[PDB]
Ligand code: HEM
């Protein structure tokens with residue numbers, strides 16, 4: 454259960470802060486000094502490398518993320534979508550999402566409580582993925598997928614294959630090619646239909662609370678076809694649930710072998726929310742220790758391990774001449790595991806993020822940094838606190854003997870094993 458990132462870690466440690474590599478069968482330079490991270494990520498002068506993102510824009514010759522918000526590299530084209538889409542992420546937009554967050558988390562916990570007999574194995578990876586998908590579908594596009602309740606099996610199956618498609622396409626077979634193409638076309642069709650269903654409600658003068666769909670449509674205002682829209686549809690559908698689910702899955706997985714931390718987490722949910730059923734916005738800020746545990750989870754287990762920038766002009770980086778036209782790779786996974794940046798890096802220790810501790814300085818970036826940072830950071834941090842808070846209040850988890858703690862790389866990092874647990878009530 455090692456990943457290509459673990460090899461980059463070995464080389465960063467051994468060959469220093471500037472290392473030429475092969476990723477996606479392409480030359481790049483991995484750059485792992487905090488000073489280089491600041492200089493390149495913190496300036497609008499450096500932009501994403503279209504070359505490295507082509508594997509999201511299209512897969513197996515089927516259009517996927519296209520020139521959506523993640524995969525668009527040109528600053529001006531990106532800046533135009535971002536300025537608009539940003540509105541759906543205001544403090545007030547996010548406050549409004551609390552209900553969706555509580556509703557899905559509650560439904561999750563209820564489903565789990567029904568299986569909490571200590572004998573039924575439950576894939577926490579699958580359940581968390583269904584939750585995150587149901588949350589995203591509702592919060593972003595105003596649709597109920599009810600995957601938690603067994604619905605939309607074809608859609609979840611389509612996301613699954615598509616993800617494996619992204620996995621096979623850039624790294625490594627007859628049916629897979631067909632399945633993946635079909636899955637990508639199904640996803641884009643799903644988006645067609647949900648855009649239509651929104652348009653027809655609007656056509657009949659119905660009222661629509663501003664959301665992500667509202668701003669994606671709005672950014673597509675004046676285009677002859679809606680292919681840009683479906684790009685942004687698939688972008689958010691995927692990016693707005695997969696990393697959250699992976700992050701939750703890693704956190705649950707790790708906590709199963711951290712009883713003392715669970716005890717403090719439990720003690721904390723009690724003090725701040727009690728046995729209350731609904732979490733208020735202001736409740737989130739007070740779950741400070743849960744916050745540290747999630748931060749520490751992202752340090753060791755970042756679903757999105759890093760990012761690429763195009764270095765346009767030959768530049769000196771930490772004493773090494775790097776030629777112009779070179780993709781720079783930045784890895785929060787790598788830096789998180791280097792003892793030069795984090796003491797005893799392999800130890801899961803949430804006190805690293807405790808009150809009074811200096812904040813890691815450009816050595817930790819699970820949502821990236823600068824202008825290309827994650828638009829959904831706060832959205833994500835909120836949903837996962839809501840979900841974990843409810844789990845911690847009501848349930849205890851035990852990993853099914855034989856479950857491993859390792860990682861795998863699909864389109865993101867996620868647990869190698871499905872996180873099979875048996876459940877008991879707290
Ligand atoms: C804990 C979960 C999350 C983490 C770890 C996370 C991680 C990241 C990272 C590292 C970036 C940079 C990608 C790159 O440079 O190529 C990114 C991009 C972004 N993610 Fe997130 N993300 C998560 C949750 C969310 C959610 C919930 C949303 C949507 C609701 C979302 C939407 C976005 C989008 C659209 C981008 C592109 C931003 C831009 O270039 O303007 N993510 N995410």
Ligand SMILES: C[C@@](O)(CS(=O)(=O)c1ccc(F)cc1)C(=O)Nc1ccc(C#N)c(C(F)(F)F)c1
Pocket residue numbers: 477505506508509523619623691692695696757758759760761863864865
């Ligand atoms: C194809 C690849 O899986 C591989 S990668 O190793 O070149 C890579 C991983 C993570 C990155 F942030 C950037 C690149 C990939 O680009 N995945 C990727 C990148 C960003 C995002 C975001 N946001 C996602 C996500 F699935 F949408 F979350 C996947």
